[PDB]
Amino acid sequence: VEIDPFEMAVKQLERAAQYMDISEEALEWLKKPMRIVEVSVPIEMDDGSVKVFTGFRVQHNWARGPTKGGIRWHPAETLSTVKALATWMTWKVAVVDLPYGGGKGGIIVNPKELSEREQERLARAYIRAVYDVIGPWTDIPAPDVYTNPKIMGWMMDEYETIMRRKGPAFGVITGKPLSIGGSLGRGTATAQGAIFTIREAAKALGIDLKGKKIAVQGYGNAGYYTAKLAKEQLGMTVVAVSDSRGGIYNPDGLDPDEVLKWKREHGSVKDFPGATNITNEELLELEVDVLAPAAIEEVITEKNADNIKAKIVAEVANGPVTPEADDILREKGILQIPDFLCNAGGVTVSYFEWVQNINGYYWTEEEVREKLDKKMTKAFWEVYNTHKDKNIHMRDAAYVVAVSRVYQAMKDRGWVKK
Ligand SMILES: N[C@@H](CCC(=O)O)C(=O)O
User: Fold this and answer.
1) Binding-site positions for NAD(+)
2) Which has the closest alpha carbon to 290: 218, 244, 255, 240?
3) Which residues is 301 bridged to in the sheet?
4) Which of UniProt's keywords are assigned here?
5) What are the residue ranges of CATH 3.40.50.720 in the chain?
6) Which helix (H) or strand (E) is 229 found in, with range?
7) 362 in helix, strand or coil?
8) Architecture, CATH, for domain 35-180
């Protein structure tokens, strides 16, 4: 009825585990986060009053290393959502082979009504509250929904103040500004990883992307950068983009820069000059070769699953395809890139930033791009090889790979004897 996120995550995990040989005790261990921390976050309001907010910090599993995850500042943020996202982050960092665990944070707050001073106070108070469970080798937060690198810098500064500079305080948190322990290529990380996965999928299917058409659903940061990177690196034709308000259709192709400027100047991509105006519900069914949903989740359902005509569906967003839609698309012979594999570039570049901070030596744009390319190509090819060996779904193969890595790490530590 309410479809609790944690219940759905556990159901997904059970579905995945039924496709592989895993002990019952390890599955029961994986069904529950290893540590959940709920703290009060008191800040001083600009009018002088004191308001108390609820903060979360869930560390699902740290068998493979320190936990990794973002912090969400959303008025509708709950503990269940944080737990489910930490569980998903575990598999996200496991599939792309990072020495990380699963983690997530969140504060129930509406940041649109907070001033800059109040936002800084909130970040510093959250750090002061969760200092006891975070660290460069314990738990590394990251930017997420309604959180930017500015909050990352404030949080790192507060952590460094509390820690008294006894170690790599830069590495306690990622996504920071370039002036303070930042990393090159952070802004376009997720889209770059998605482009690498799309290129590898095209390589697997034997189709060249030069001159092909791509439709991107959702024109935020991820969607815009995905369309732009596809057009430049992959040589594809950006035929259709969209946002919440509406969508754009143009057979001759769309210039992502022009569309972004129009959206910035009018608040939406609606009524772009010399272009057909459509919505998402027909955008998802346009005849394309690559479809990249980069917007609100659950856009492909059994209603529209049979009408999808894309050869490759790159799930840039977090879970935009329902399991029934997954089965329908697999029946049609459409290669799907799993949600927590396609957008694994952001966490990979976050790991690169953490490595740079820990080592004290910082890389260049080309080095980061090449390392990200290697990691994403290897992860995608491992997932596709499992998908070809086990004759299962692509999402199922990615789950098998991630859960197998986590289970092996748990067995090596002696946490589970079977
Ligand atoms: N939460 C973001 C940040 C990456 C990270 O966890 O380091 C993501 O999953 O992409």
Assistant:
1) 218-224
2) 240
3) none
4) NAD, NADP, Oxidoreductase
5) 181-417
6) helix 221-229
7) coil
8) 3-Layer(aba) Sandwich (3.40)
- Closest residue by Cα to atom 7, ligand 1, is 347
> What's the CA-to-centroid distance between 271 and ligand 1, angstroms?
34
Note the residue count of the chain: 418
- Looking at the chain, the domain(s) classified CATH 3.40.50.10860 span 35-180
For this PDB entry, the determination method is cryo-EM
Q: How far is the CA of 285 from the centre of ligand 1 (A)?
A: 30
Q: Are strands 50-61 and 101-108 parallel, antiparallel or unpaired?
A: antiparallel
Contact in structure between 33 and 10 (CB atoms under 8 Å): no
Identify the bridge partners of residue 51 per DSSP, sorted by sequence position.
43
Q: Which residues contact 179 (CB under 8 A, 6 or more apart)?
A: none
Tokens of 399: 């789950």
Q: What is the resolution of this structure in A?
A: 2.9
- Could you tell me how many helices (H) and strands (E) the chain has, helices first? 15, 13
Which residue is closest in CA terms to ligand 1's atom 1?
70
Q: Does residue 376's CB lie within 6 angstroms of at least one atom of ligand 1?
A: no
Q: Find tokens 């005790």 and name the residue.
A: 25
Q: What CATH number is given for 181-417 in this structure?
A: 3.40.50.720
